[PDB]
Amino acid sequence: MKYLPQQDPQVFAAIEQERKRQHAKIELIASENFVSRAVMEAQGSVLTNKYAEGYPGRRYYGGCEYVDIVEELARERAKQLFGAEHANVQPHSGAQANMAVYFTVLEHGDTVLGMNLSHGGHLTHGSPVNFSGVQYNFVAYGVDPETHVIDYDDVREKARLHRPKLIVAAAAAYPRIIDFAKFREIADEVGAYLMVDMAHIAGLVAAGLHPNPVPYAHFVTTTTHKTLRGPRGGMILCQEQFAKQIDKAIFPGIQGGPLMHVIAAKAVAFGEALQDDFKAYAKRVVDNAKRLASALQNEGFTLVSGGTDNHLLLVDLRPQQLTGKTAEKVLDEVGITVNKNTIPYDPESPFVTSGIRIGTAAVTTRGFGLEEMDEIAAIIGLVLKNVGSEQALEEARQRVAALTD
Amino acid sequence: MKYLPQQDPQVFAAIEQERKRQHAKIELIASENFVSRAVMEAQGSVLTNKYAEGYPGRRYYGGCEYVDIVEELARERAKQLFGAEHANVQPHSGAQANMAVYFTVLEHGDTVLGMNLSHGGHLTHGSPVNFSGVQYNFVAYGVDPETHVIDYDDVREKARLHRPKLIVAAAAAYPRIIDFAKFREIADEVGAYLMVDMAHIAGLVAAGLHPNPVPYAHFVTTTTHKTLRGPRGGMILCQEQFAKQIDKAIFPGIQGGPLMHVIAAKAVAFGEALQDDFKAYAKRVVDNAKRLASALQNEGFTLVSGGTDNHLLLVDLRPQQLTGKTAEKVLDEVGITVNKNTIPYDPESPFVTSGIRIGTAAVTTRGFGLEEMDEIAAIIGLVLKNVGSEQALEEARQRVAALTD
Incomplete structure (x- = not known):
């Protein structure tokens, strides 16, 4: 950019924050x-x-x-x-x-x-x-x-x-x-x-x-x-x-x-x-989604429909006694972006939920492959199985940083 | 632009045509x-x-x-x-x-x-x-x-x-x-x-x-x-x-x-x-609109409401026995962009009309002043009073070119 930095410092600074955020975080919002x-x-x-x-x-x-x-x-x-x-x-x-x-x-x-x-x-x-x-x-x-x-x-x-x-x-x-x-x-x-x-x-x-x-x-x-x-x-x-x-x-x-x-x-x-x-x-999007699904199951997570045919998956968090909202919040703390999502026949309201929705389209675009999927799942496992441990969250935070360079 | 010219020659060429068109023409669409x-x-x-x-x-x-x-x-x-x-x-x-x-x-x-x-x-x-x-x-x-x-x-x-x-x-x-x-x-x-x-x-x-x-x-x-x-x-x-x-x-x-x-x-x-x-x-937009209105009246044109308080004016073309559609088409031939527009109590349909709508916002942005308004009105006069003369239209075409550099 050339003219926006001079014309509007406030707007340019905010855009630049967003640009850097997009690079720093692991983006798993399925629609992005x-x-x-x-x-x-x-x-x-x-x-x-x-x-x-x-x-x-x-x-x-x-x-x-x-x-x-x-x-x-x-x-x-x-x-x-x-x-x-x-x-x-x-x-x-x-x-x-x-x-x-x-x-x-x-x-x-x-x-x-x-x-x-x-x-x-x-x-x-x-x-x-x-x-x-x-x-x-x-x-x-x-x-x-x-x-x-x-x-x-x-x-x-x-x-x-x-x-x-x-x-x-x-x-x-x-x-x-x-x-x-x-x-x-x-x-x-x-x-x-x-x-x-x-x-x-x-x-x-x-x-x-x-x-x-x-x-x-x-x-x-x-x-x-x-x-x-x-x-x-x-x-x-x-x-x-x-x-x-x-x-x-x-x-x-x-x-x-x-x-x-x-x-x-x-x-x-x-x-x-x-x-x-x-x-x-x-x-690669689909292959990565299958790999991520498999690797999450390996971590002990239950997936809606037992896996995926496409770009997206849903984790049923009931076995871990977590809400989608709790999972969303804690993953945000380590630099992983998901959204809480209702699971079929969810006992919770859509504002709380029993699940998280994850997609691979964004990470595949930035060049993530099967090995990265294995690591993403391992980090999610570390976080959601240790929600009360700040050292686990700091480790996850560092491992996210390693993935995004 | 840097990456679009290499990635999409077709789309880049069309955009570049539009960029140059925007500079070449006298843009009088009131909403632009x-x-x-x-x-x-x-x-x-x-x-x-x-x-x-x-x-x-x-x-x-x-x-x-x-x-x-x-x-x-x-x-x-x-x-x-x-x-x-x-x-x-x-x-x-x-x-x-x-x-x-x-x-x-x-x-x-x-x-x-x-x-x-x-x-x-x-x-x-x-x-x-x-x-x-x-x-x-x-x-x-x-x-x-x-x-x-x-x-x-x-x-x-x-x-x-x-x-x-x-x-x-x-x-x-x-x-x-x-x-x-x-x-x-x-x-x-x-x-x-x-x-x-x-x-x-x-x-x-x-x-x-x-x-x-x-x-x-x-x-x-x-x-x-x-x-x-x-x-x-x-x-x-x-x-x-x-x-x-x-x-x-x-x-x-x-x-x-x-x-x-x-x-x-x-x-x-x-x-x-x-x-x-x-x-x-x-x-300047408003001043230019007033000036253009006055200069068009000087050419013998009737304006809806007898002038303007804002950025836009409407020419009632009935005295010249022209439709808005005819006026729109011929002005397009000389590089002046207007749109046909219904006048109040128009005897014509909205697809034909008895008027043209003109605005000064676009030309004022590119730096046009009162003198330019006088000339724009003079060109419009030359065109609409001599719709059957190709030499008048060529003169108008050259005068439009003089205005846009």
Whole structure:
């Protein structure tokens, strides 16, 4: 940076603290990643100056010739990446991507079937304090109490009983592969649309390490900033038959002017994802998650679903008689960033929880491999089995420092 | 830029075209501006990597210590700038800022009173193809057919007849000062909340050149990217009594993770607005708008409301027997960027229009003064009075080139 240090000492100092923090800590928040310097440069571009309501070649402002190229690059790369017939790269976020799909196919008060929020579902999948649960009538399907795998017979019964206009598949905290074929089969039985929110697993889908929801879902939503390793924002994929309606839902429906600089960064991120090395990266994410899962089990930890098929895992802390909140706090003390997370059939409230959610996307980006996973698990073991020992926590603190250089 | 040119030739080339376009053209889109290099650097920062759901000191992720400082700097500077008791700097856009306020005080189907969209009102103020008009029952007040000034007796009658739960004041294309005192007086008579959407005039409010809606409105919404000259995004101001409800409406209500890098840029933009030179800048914007208005009248053009009190003006093209669409297209040919815009009581559809909307914020930022305004008006005169003459258009093209260097 050059001009920010001179113009705003306060803001520059705070950003510099954040930059250094991102390097010093072991980042295990499952939804986080590190973007390339190219993605950031695109976001820091003059494209923020341009009003571009509408779509490429069909704008409501003049002078959009070059931002049109940028948006088309984003749309076409996404389509190549996911095999979709249409992309909308304007959603400001995952929330807005989901909001737009709901706005497209649902009327106020329509019934929607989504994943139980305490079993893995996201806030935008029917939380009573979120627009989704306030605007629409959300019912929920659950996971099996033993296996923690989605109970597809429950999905089917809930759909047949409540007759939703829309079924939502996908999760903020589900460690196993989702069967989109079964979701579509159930959707077809009850005459419901199928929406897949692939936000968490999008990078893995692109690399072919998770089944692609595109051929099965009427609508696929995602964030660009999780496993996809792009800028903060949203995206909608769908077939040509919904293309016009989806575009209208985003604008003039729920948004105004798109963030053209962020869309530029989306294009960059998609360009990177199309490369061979991103496929290798994404495999390492999954391999690292499996390794970390195995190594945590070796430490004596119980994992939700008994392991993982993807980038993320959940530790059931009940055997150690710890809350997710306690675990989160103490790991923060040694430089390991996790978040407390509800486990399926959690006896605790979502503000306390019996678990922690861990992901490998961020650490894999910085170059962590299987050996690092073994060590991360060993540190977590040392910390959580010795919460009252300041010497154990200091040892953990030093071992975290050794890993991050 | 360094890494984007190597990583993505296609995206870099398109951005570079846009950068050069922004310099070459005379930018008169009323909602546009040019941000500082400091604002852009903040947006191009590593802060995009951080999930920060919730608010400073009350986050739902660990490691937010430094993004908390950034957000607080943004909130406190905004409060200093506008004299507000509370700020929410998380809205992704003006659309989302408005959406959150509607979500706070209204139920589905509630009556809202807003400015007639063909008289100056924005899409988010009750368009039937926008969430606002679909989710809520919007009624409209108008401007006087002669003066084009808001008819406050009409605002009062519409409020008394339809009994709205909320009154919205402010506009996307209104060239005169809005009387927020009268809006509040009417709001109090019918027991309605008052929302002011100051998006367009926010920079002028901050510099003291337009009356401040804050002391009069329960809620003030704005974009950060118009006269305020900040990054693309939204903001909500309100009194302490609505602070908690407004924060809840943004999250977990209508959004998810905030754009911390954009919030950093918002703080930078507010820092700049607090400086003496921004006040001088904003006065030049208004002075330039008055000068341009006067010079256009000198060319023989009729202006909506007979002039301007702010940054923007509207040309009624009916005397020249031109549509806004025709005027927009031909000015595009010579390098002058305007947008077609409905005039009050327009005989044409919003896709054709009888007017063009012009603003001075962008050209004032690049250093244009009164003499430049005289020349811009003279060029517009040459073009619109000689639409069929390619030699007149070539002369105009050269004169535009002379202005932009």
